[PDB]
Design a protein around this ligand. Structure first.
Ligand code: FX5
Length: 110
């Protein structure tokens, strides 16, 4: 069984994962797993602390987050990373902005 804190962390995680735009697209999809270092080596020269949602979920399911802010900080790092690597005109950049706002609104509601 999972702790109440794990259940709250999961509610925040699922809110980001499952958010859909007006067309029904989950903006989380590209963030679930980073490209490999072999695939995209220059990402890892620009981004000093890589993060994706696979990492966050396994940490949460390993009962390692002591509170909600610790998870939020990892999401914020991931979205900051996406917006550092990609240009502001790009779709991934814009998706990261929206999901960062979704994250904060979810934390406020909970
Ligand atoms: N351009 C990209 N930027 N960022 C990510 C990315 C993925 C997960 C977590 C954080 C991230 O920043 C992925 C990207 N692409 C995937 C598709 N193939 C081209 C590279």
């Amino acid at each position: 069984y999972m702790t109440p804190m794990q259940q709250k962390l999961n509610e925040v995680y699922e809110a980001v994962k499952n958010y859909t735009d007006k067309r029904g697209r989950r903006l989380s999809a590209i963030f679930l797993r980073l490209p490999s270092r072999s695939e995209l080596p220059d990402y890892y020269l620009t981004i000093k602390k890589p993060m994706d949602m696979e990492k966050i979920r396994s940490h949460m399911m390993a009962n390692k987050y002591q509170d909600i802010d610790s998870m939020v900080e990892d999401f914020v790092m991931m979205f900051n990373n996406a917006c550092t690597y990609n240009e502001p005109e790009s779709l991934i950049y814009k998706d990261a902005l929206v999901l960062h706002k979704v994250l904060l609104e979810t934390r406020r509601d909970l």
